[PDB]
Write a protein that holds these residues in place. Structure first.
Motif, PDB file in Angstrom:
ATOM      1  N   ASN A  77       1.311 -12.851 -18.076  1.00 14.82           N
ATOM      2  CA  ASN A  77       0.858 -13.060 -16.709  1.00 14.82           C
ATOM      3  C   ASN A  77      -0.308 -12.122 -16.434  1.00 14.82           C
ATOM      4  N   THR A 113      -2.061  -9.879 -14.720  1.00 10.29           N
ATOM      5  CA  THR A 113      -1.977  -8.918 -13.628  1.00 10.29           C
ATOM      6  C   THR A 113      -2.927  -7.744 -13.835  1.00 10.29           C
ATOM      7  N   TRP A 166      -3.880 -13.905 -11.883  1.00  8.17           N
ATOM      8  CA  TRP A 166      -2.538 -14.322 -11.482  1.00  8.17           C
ATOM      9  C   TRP A 166      -2.171 -15.667 -12.106  1.00  8.17           C
ATOM     10  N   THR A 206      -0.643 -17.618 -15.926  1.00  7.84           N
ATOM     11  CA  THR A 206       0.225 -17.407 -17.075  1.00  7.84           C
ATOM     12  C   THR A 206      -0.240 -18.248 -18.257  1.00  7.84           C
TER      13      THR A 206
HETATM   14  C1  LIG Z   1       2.405 -13.385 -12.012  1.00  6.20           C
HETATM   15  O1  LIG Z   1       2.197 -12.178 -11.270  1.00  6.20           O
HETATM   16  C2  LIG Z   1       1.893 -12.385  -9.882  1.00  6.20           C
HETATM   17  C3  LIG Z   1       1.629 -11.022  -9.289  1.00  6.20           C
HETATM   18  O2  LIG Z   1       2.544 -10.055  -9.786  1.00  6.20           O
HETATM   19  C4  LIG Z   1       3.046 -13.117  -9.204  1.00  6.20           C
HETATM   20  O3  LIG Z   1       2.697 -13.385  -7.851  1.00  6.20           O
HETATM   21  C5  LIG Z   1       3.341 -14.420  -9.933  1.00  6.20           C
HETATM   22  O4  LIG Z   1       4.491 -15.041  -9.371  1.00  6.20           O
HETATM   23  C6  LIG Z   1       3.579 -14.158 -11.417  1.00  6.20           C
HETATM   24  N1  LIG Z   1       3.800 -15.407 -12.126  1.00  6.20           N
HETATM   25  C7  LIG Z   1       5.016 -15.908 -12.357  1.00  6.20           C
HETATM   26  C8  LIG Z   1       5.060 -17.208 -13.101  1.00  6.20           C
HETATM   27  O5  LIG Z   1       6.035 -15.337 -11.985  1.00  6.20           O
END
Ligand SMILES: *[C@@H]1O[C@H](CO)[C@@H](O)[C@H](O)[C@H]1NC(C)=O
Ligand SMILES: CC(=O)N[C@H]1[C@H](O[C@@H]2[C@@H](O)[C@H](O)O[C@H](CO)[C@@H]2O)O[C@H](CO)[C@@H](O[C@@H]2O[C@H](CO[C@]3(C(=O)O)C[C@H](O)[C@@H](NC(C)=O)[C@H]([C@H](O)[C@H](O)CO)O3)[C@H](O)[C@H](O)[C@H]2O)[C@@H]1O
Ligand SMILES: CC(=O)N[C@H]1[C@H](O[C@@H]2[C@@H](O)[C@H](O)O[C@H](CO)[C@@H]2O)O[C@H](CO)[C@@H](O[C@@H]2O[C@H](CO[C@]3(C(=O)O)C[C@H](O)[C@@H](NC(C)=O)[C@H]([C@H](O)[C@H](O)CO)O3)[C@H](O)[C@H](O)[C@H]2O)[C@@H]1O
Ligand SMILES: CC(=O)N[C@H]1[C@H](O[C@@H]2[C@@H](O)[C@H](O)O[C@H](CO)[C@@H]2O)O[C@H](CO)[C@@H](O[C@@H]2O[C@H](CO[C@]3(C(=O)O)C[C@H](O)[C@@H](NC(C)=O)[C@H]([C@H](O)[C@H](O)CO)O3)[C@H](O)[C@H](O)[C@H]2O)[C@@H]1O
Ligand SMILES: *[C@@H]1O[C@H](CO)[C@@H](O)[C@H](O)[C@H]1NC(C)=O
Ligand SMILES: *[C@@H]1O[C@H](CO)[C@@H](O)[C@H](O)[C@H]1NC(C)=O
Ligand SMILES: *[C@@H]1O[C@H](CO)[C@@H](O)[C@H](O)[C@H]1NC(C)=O
Ligand SMILES: *[C@@H]1O[C@H](CO)[C@@H](O)[C@H](O)[C@H]1NC(C)=O
Ligand SMILES: *[C@@H]1O[C@H](CO)[C@@H](O)[C@H](O)[C@H]1NC(C)=O
Ligand SMILES: *[C@@H]1O[C@H](CO)[C@@H](O)[C@H](O)[C@H]1NC(C)=O
Ligand SMILES: *[C@@H]1O[C@H](CO)[C@@H](O)[C@H](O)[C@H]1NC(C)=O
Lengths: 488, 489, 489
Positions: free
Chosen positions: B164, B166, B235, B237
């Motif tokens: 992810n 970030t 943000w 994946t």
């Molecule tokens: C990836 O990280 C962002 C920020 O931390 C978050 O909002 C998002 O839900 C995350 N992606 C998943 C698939 O959980």
């Protein structure tokens, strides 16, 4: 006792630029660049535009449930679209050759929807699928121009459909392939694994296979839908075959009429007005060969440049006198033409004006301005192409080409105006001097130069004599004898 | 007493070209074309460029064992790459969308390497595979930024991995697929046949199948490795799934800075110097508006014109030839105070002089003319340079034709401007001299006599103050009219 | 006595256009635009072209049985092809990257067909397959340069072949893949089901799978045949491997000349001539800088412009009307020996003459101007014709836009330059005549009488010798100073 030569002055405060001097006040000028626009989005030649609203081209052609008003659109002149439309593919996925489809739409002015594959012909399949991504009144729904085929009972027979183009002109057909998320989804929907989707025409042969993999959730789903399009020619046939994962079309789009159009990216709404040249900022009502409103215009728009001022000099320099001649400066009270005389004989004075020289100069400058203006070749402008994220080099090429052409035309315009202004401002002085020299050489040795611009007579040249002097027919011997007596 | 009208001449040897005449000598001239350079590669605005050496972009990004000096690269201003880099894809193969990757790198200016998928996470596979093509100190090795996954024992479980984004900016990720030579290699490495490699993002969906076939041997191997890349948004994946033949990434390249840059194709090295414009041959330290050194440039540079001489005419024509006469024969070599002037020869003495108003007017006109010519050109941070594969010859031809046409157009425009303003300036000077002569003649009237060489012969006795008034405009006809008639009679 | 100054007039009816007026008649004019051709397609530099007739490039390279006249083709200067050829792919199908192949053929002047994989080495497969789409005298046949592989008996072993490029230059190789209609056809022809075709070189890696589906009938067949090509470098190998559906090559096309040529879309034949430039409408034989025949040309020739008339004014304005008057009233029809000249009428006759210096100066200036507007053109062997597919409309529009923009720019430049040059020369002649008059007046001075028309009545008695003295420029002022004073009063 006095006949003098001088030029015309007035109260004008217009400034033109030459190549040897800037901020030159002139009597008459002519702006050849327009900088004003109406400010509204209007109808092009009386034809209303296609107002997509918050919908995309894909959403309009596929039948997104939110774009329900765009189901029977009439004739249009150009397409109005937003930069980031909200209502596109409600079900996540892609659209192959989207920009080519948009380029094709940039030359189509009407579509007619033809029912090619009716939804009730699939007697051995289920045609009531849907999703909550495209939901109306809470319940699931789907695209209104497509059919989702699903197993009936516990079997998925091979689905075959064909169509022969007997509509009259070319047809646009869009189909899709569904990619599930996991194997259980595929087994629940189509009952088989290892499926294929085959589409074939006389010039097309495509076979696609589904992809099953866990994907990041877009609009709450891990599945995707890939859409493809083709142009079916007249008297041709299209064949469909699939053991699963087929989103069959139900309507085809027939090109009704063709022409010149385009896609304009604006966030505005159409208002009641009629226009010929339409920029993304507003309409234009112009006749000049240049403008600096917007590059990506649609219509017959003259030319775009980064010059903020293009003024041609149509008259003389404004040099007020602080009876003198043309050395001191121009004359304020000589409102009859451009070049002329002044006299103070016994009868009475008066600011006359030469006719032939002024007419010749007026014709010459008019021809100059008309030659500059009427050599632009203005055609239909519909520039503006869309490129994908994997075609950056082509986008850079297009941008560089437009920038270079724009710079070249800007340079040409500035050079032309500067050189033309200098030449005209020299032309006027040359004409004044030519008139003075002609008068002096015809008068010969019966006059006295005063060094300020004119003469003093050695004899009593009465009003008829004076008009003859201005007429160009002045008899030398018939007044010669007296002039010798006084001069000595 | 006498007075004459003449202009300035000196020992200049400059030459300007006009449309009506070639090789015209002038007193003053201005050169507006730059043709010299330092022959060096220097730092742009104090920031040194990236020196790849014998390494290609693919070798740097993939982590070639011979490009280990580039495992941590600071900020740069442009990239230096050789025409045919030697240290590249050590394992034979290809690289999809390589030219697009280079074009993206043309506007990056800095990267940050972030470990997105650590190597020790693959607890159900083997991560110690290497080849003799990418060998260090005899032993086999592999790319330093990629992981080769191989069966563990006698099993190859389904491999899955995700990341992810970030980090705060866009990230570039590269993966790969291995194409073996024969089936026994496939069974030895992965224990099963009929495998796939699946990569998926929010906007990407790709599935690949390895190809097993005998190929001509390159670097001793018939197998190949195919590499692909993507740009992961903030943000977002990325998902990896494979039943075999996956070369997983260990690192991702985050875009830290952004700006205007490019890739230079040179075989030279970096030298300790600074500049604001760059060419593959050398730097340019100039303020003139044009140049003809090299088409390929990085930074705000004078426009390129296929020309060898672009010289403007500032002064007058040169006729060295000069009782002292006037402008009929030529200019005066002793009137070094200006451009137009007089020569008075009364009984008190003699001496040249210069008129201030005409000289000032001509100077202002010439200066603003050259300002107008120079300042009507727009120079931006152009980053010329683009690469095309062997299946895009038409695109390369299009780009070459576009560039050549625009360069030719600009050369013609500049040449015509110079050639026409030179003649205009010469005619301007001739007209100004004639205008001064005519003004003096009209103010003098019949008090004098013309000798037909630009000079006048006064009839009265014009003293120093009388001549000073004559070259001043404060000359009174009646004050000497009465005696004037006597001399003529 | 009398001596008048004027210019020369004749009976010409040539017209030029300026920026201040139109319909301007001049004594001499030069046309710089060629608007005529030969109307026929002929040889270039002695080398005859290649006439494809009704065949296409694909039909010629593949070996279509109708194009049997092109099984051995000599060196060519350019290729002539029809807009919609009839004899192309006799078997329905497609040709991948056709436009790139045509672009490559636009720079090749000869081929040498080389047998790389004979037909007798396939000892385990049938090689005598044909179709009724490609039929010779009713019996089915096939492409002459390709081989169709079919099961022998009831078995289709793994077909394998290779060729090493030892010819001496780059080679072109074409292979095909067959897509049947139904599974019965696949079983009849290739026995097994689920086949593959793999072609691999040092830089190529492809694997194709046949597609079986029901399709609309083209040429009576629902099946298709897909063709691909590659460029094999020297000392390189190509590997073929297939379990079915392989259309193997038998000949390779070695590049042997590698010059500059093109493809001309014409619907005509070739005649016996010899030219230097070749447009689709006809051949051009000229020595002028411009032409408006056709945008697309082959060879070396003037540049194209979209205009109808480009005339340069060399001579003087033609006003007929001329005791004898001078240049103020107009020109003369009597002194056909130069442009400007004198006219004298003394007591020992009358006649005309010409001032050689002024005429020579004006002639050299005009010739320099003409040669400067002509010789600044950049002429080269450029390629214009390009081809694009039905899925490359944006690229085609880009190319069309670029060509139209450059054409418009150059047309506008030519027109405006012509107008400005005409204005300058028509003013230049008048300035020269006026300068001659003023020079004679300044030299001659008080011993004479101006008369308005443009000449001078002497205040003394003069003969021929004095007339030459005035004409050469050496006129002794004092030798008549006393005499002229007496006759003045
Ligand atoms: C990836 O990280 C962002 C920020 O931390 C978050 O909002 C998002 O839900 C995350 N992606 C998943 C698939 O959980
Ligand atoms: C029709 C339905 O609602 N099916 C759900 C499924 O239920 C099964 C039943 O049909 C079968 O006989 O027995 C099993 C139990 O053995 C179930 O009861 O159960 C799934 C989870 O267990 C659901 O999963 C969720 O589906 C979501 C999507 O639903 C929709 C959507 O909103 O997009 C709408 C439809 O229900 C569904 N099917 C069709 C034919 O349209 C579609 C479809 O699944 C995909 O959109 C396209 O492949 O999607 C979400 O995907 C959620 O993430 C998932 O867990 C079944 O909905
Ligand atoms: C690990 C190794 O060296 N394997 C070699 C293999 O050995 C077999 C072993 O795996 C098995 O358990 O037991 C038998 C004996 O019972 C063998 O010892 O034997 C092959 C020949 O029969 C070798 O093949 C040659 O490999 C060459 C390439 O070598 C390397 C390389 O440097 O690229 C060595 C690497 O260790 C090997 N493995 C990995 C995970 O990278 C790679 C790999 O096999 C290839 O990259 C596959 O594409 O290859 C040449 O290719 C040569 O042509 C070939 O005969 C095995 O190296
Ligand atoms: C060689 C031949 O004559 N094949 C025909 C085929 O033959 C049968 C045989 O295979 C079987 O063992 O015994 C039966 C009798 O018990 C037959 O003799 O029968 C087909 C119809 O049942 C014919 O089908 C038609 O073929 C047409 C095309 O003929 C050609 C062509 O012109 O393309 C020529 C050759 O027959 C064949 N080429 C070969 C074998 O090298 C090609 C071949 O079918 C290609 O795959 C073309 O797609 O076809 C039409 O295609 C027509 O639509 C079809 O019904 C066989 O000709
Ligand atoms: C000419 O006038 C403009 C105002 O329109 C002024 O900004 C400019 O400075 C002036 N030019 C000069 C040389 O003073
Ligand atoms: C499609 O319809 C037209 C109608 O004229 C017909 O000629 C043509 O044969 C049809 N196509 C097929 C494949 O039957
Ligand atoms: C002036 O010339 C015009 C020519 O149209 C003539 O009609 C008029 O009578 C003339 N006047 C004098 C006073 O010569
Ligand atoms: C002008 O000078 C150059 C060298 O300075 C010479 O090559 C050229 O021939 C000269 N041209 C003329 C017309 O004298
Ligand atoms: C010369 O002219 C200037 C004009 O400002 C005047 O001030 C000065 O007195 C004049 N000199 C003579 C000697 O007349
Ligand atoms: C010049 O003459 C042509 C005919 O040769 C004519 O068509 C054109 O209109 C004329 N120009 C003007 C300004 O009348
Ligand atoms: C192809 O031929 C060249 C020269 O004959 C040779 O060097 C090369 O090794 C050959 N290729 C192979 C794969 O053996």
């Amino acid at each position: 006792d006095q006949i003098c030569i001088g030029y015309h002055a007035n109260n004008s405060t217009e400034t033109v630029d030459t190549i040897l001097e800037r901020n030159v006040t002139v009597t008459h000028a002519k702006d050849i660049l327009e900088k004003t626009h109406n400010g509204k989005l209007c109808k092009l030649n009386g034809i209303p535009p296609l107002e997509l609203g918050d919908c995309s081209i894909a959403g309009w052609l596929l039948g997104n449930p939110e774009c329900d008003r765009l189901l029977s659109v009439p004739e249009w002149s150009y397409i109005m679209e937003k930069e980031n439309p909200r209502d596109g593919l409600c079900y996540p996925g892609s659209f192959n050759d989207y920009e080519e489809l948009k380029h094709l739409l940039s030359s189509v002015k009407h579509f007619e929807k033809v029912k090619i594959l009716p939804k009730d012909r699939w007697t051995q399949h289920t045609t009531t699928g849907g999703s909550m991504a495209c939901a109306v009144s809470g319940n699931p729904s789907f695209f209104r121009n497509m059919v989702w085929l699903t197993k009936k009972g516990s079997n998925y027979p091979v689905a075959k459909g064909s169509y022969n183009n007997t509509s009259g002109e070319q047809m646009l057909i869009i189909w899709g392939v569904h990619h599930p998320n996991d194997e259980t989804e595929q087994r629940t929907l189509y009952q088989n694994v290892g499926t294929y989707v085959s589409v074939g025409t006389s010039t097309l042969n495509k076979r696609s296979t589904p992809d099953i993999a866990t994907r990041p959730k877009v609009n709450g789903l891990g599945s995707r839908m890939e859409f493809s399009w083709t142009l079916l020619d007249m008297w041709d046939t299209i064949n469909f075959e699939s053991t699963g994962n087929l989103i069959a079309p139900e309507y085809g789009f027939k090109i009704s009429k063709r022409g010149s159009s385009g896609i304009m990216k604006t966030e505005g709404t159409l208002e009641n007005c009629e226009t010929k040249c339409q920029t993304p900022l507003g309409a234009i009502n112009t006749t000049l060969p240049f403008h600096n409103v917007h590059p990506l215009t649609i219509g017959e728009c003259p030319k775009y440049v980064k010059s903020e001022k293009l003024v041609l000099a149509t008259g003389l320099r404004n040099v007020p006198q602080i009876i003198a001649g043309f050395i001191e400066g121009g004359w304020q009270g000589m409102v009859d033409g451009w070049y002329g005389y002044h006299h103070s004989n016994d009868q009475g004075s008066g600011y006359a004006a030469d006719k032939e020289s002024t007419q010749k100069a007026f014709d010459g400058i008019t021809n100059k301005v008309n030659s500059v203006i009427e050599k632009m070749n203005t055609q239909f402008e519909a520039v503006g192409k869309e490129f994908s994220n994997l075609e950056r080099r082509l986008e850079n090429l297009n941008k560089k080409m437009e920038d270079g052409f724009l710079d070249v035309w800007t340079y040409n315009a500035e050079l032309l105006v500067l050189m033309e202004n200098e030449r005209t401002l020299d032309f006027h002085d040359s004409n004044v001097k030519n008139l003075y020299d002609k008068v002096r050489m015809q008068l010969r040795d019966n006059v006295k130069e005063l060094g300020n611009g004119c003469f003093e007579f050695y004899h009593k040249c009465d009003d008829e004599c004076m008009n003859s002097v201005k007429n160009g027919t002045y008899d030398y011997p018939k007044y010669e004898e007296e002039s010798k007596l006084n001069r000595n």
